[PDB]
């Protein structure tokens, strides 16, 4: 019984793993299709059964949260052995984002401009 | 000539016979009860028909009163308004301007 | 003699001063923006 997470901006991917469905749709058919190679990286760079529920965020953030849940769930069945600590280093030596989440978030808007840093045009005459 | 009837056959058949005609403001305002201070306007206008200075700008004009002269307040004075056939279907506030048009200077 | 206030309209005013202008009705406060600055301490609002 493996339970695993993945996070992007607001997206949360909850993975349940038993010895590959994304929101009940087969993985091969994840609609953003020019990014299909991204959701399959851990497979084709390194089976079993996994179940993914991703919510919140947008298209790309959801893809990137499943890219982390998938790779983090295949690291919670191997344990206490050198594979556990070596497959992690192989995963990061491609993209560290595969293991550790991206902390960035939206900053708040401040009064006097449309955005967080952009202000309003100033005039003198 | 009015929509499809000549002046004899809407000003003598029925006062509300025109409602299947004139626009949605008219049907709305007449499918609503006219305030009790402009019925007096008609039992002073149609009554003693044989010049009235009035003060209600928004009042739907319907055929039975045709060929009349009125003087409607616009805020500073009463303005004469005549009644030609095409005035039916309109309000009285469209026929007296409350502003003099600007000129040069 | 019997015509005084026939016109019907909301006369929403500030609960504290009496002004008609710039009244906040969200949440049902019904007080104006000038009086809301100084009575906000005890009503309960605080800046964070």
């Amino acid at each position: 019984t493996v339970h695993t997470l993945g996070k992007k901006k607001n997206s949360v991917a909850v993975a349940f793993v038993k010895a590959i469905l994304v929101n009940n749709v087969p993985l091969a058919l994840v609609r953003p299709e020019i990014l299909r190679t991204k959701v399959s990286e851990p497979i084709m760079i390194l089976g079993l059964d996994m179940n993914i529920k991703v919510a919140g965020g947008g298209h790309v953030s959801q893809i990137y949260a499943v890219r982390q849940a998938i790779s983090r769930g295949v690291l919670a069945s191997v344990k206490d052995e050198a594979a556990r600590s070596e497959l992690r280093a192989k995963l990061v030596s491609y993209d560290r984002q595969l293991v550790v989440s991206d902390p960035r978030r939206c900053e708040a808007k401040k009064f006097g401009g449309r955005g967080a840093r952009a202000r309003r045009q100033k005039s003198y005459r | 000539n009015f929509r499809g009837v000549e002046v004899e056959k809407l000003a003598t058949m029925k006062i509300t016979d025109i409602l299947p005609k004139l626009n949605a403001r008219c049907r709305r305002r007449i499918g609503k009860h006219g305030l009790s201070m402009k019925h007096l306007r008609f039992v002073n206008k149609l009554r003693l028909r044989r010049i009235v200075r009035t003060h209600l700008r928004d009042m739907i004009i319907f055929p039975e009163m045709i060929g009349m002269t009125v003087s409607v307040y616009n805020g500073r004075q009463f303005i004469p308004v005549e009644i030609k056939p095409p005035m039916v279907g309109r309000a009285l506030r469209e026929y007296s301007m409350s502003y003099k048009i600007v000129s040069h200077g | 003699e019997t015509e005084f206030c026939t016109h019907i309209a909301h006369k929403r005013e500030c609960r504290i001063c009496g002004n008609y202008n710039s009244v906040y009705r969200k949440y049902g406060l019904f007080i104006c923006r000038r009086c809301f600055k100084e009575n906000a301490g005890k009503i309960g609002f605080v800046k964070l």
Binding site: - | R3, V5, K21, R90, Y95 | -
Partner: protein
Amino acid sequence: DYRDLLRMFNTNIQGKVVLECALVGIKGIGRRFANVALKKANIDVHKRAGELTAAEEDALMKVLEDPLSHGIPAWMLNRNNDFESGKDMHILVNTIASTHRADLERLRKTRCERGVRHHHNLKVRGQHTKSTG
């Protein structure tokens, strides 16, 4: 086989454009009214323009001068409940000038706020006019 002009309704239709958007050349036709006048009379709406037979023009003209009979509705018409005949007319010819000008002369005789403001060549629809045109 095609022609490179349809001088129809006194308007020169060019041809080689799509007939859907060719009909919009006639002032009175839109793309809405055109796509409701072709399919209502069994004419391919988008292949070309200059491949329309004589019989196809006859069908289009017979559905142009009478929309209600072929089932085109009143709400899809432009002279609705006119102030000349109380009828849902269909003014689809270069003789729209007369009615538009009559709606001015009626105002000129009636002396309405709209007419007096239209005379001076001013905005008439409530828009602000302080901006220095």
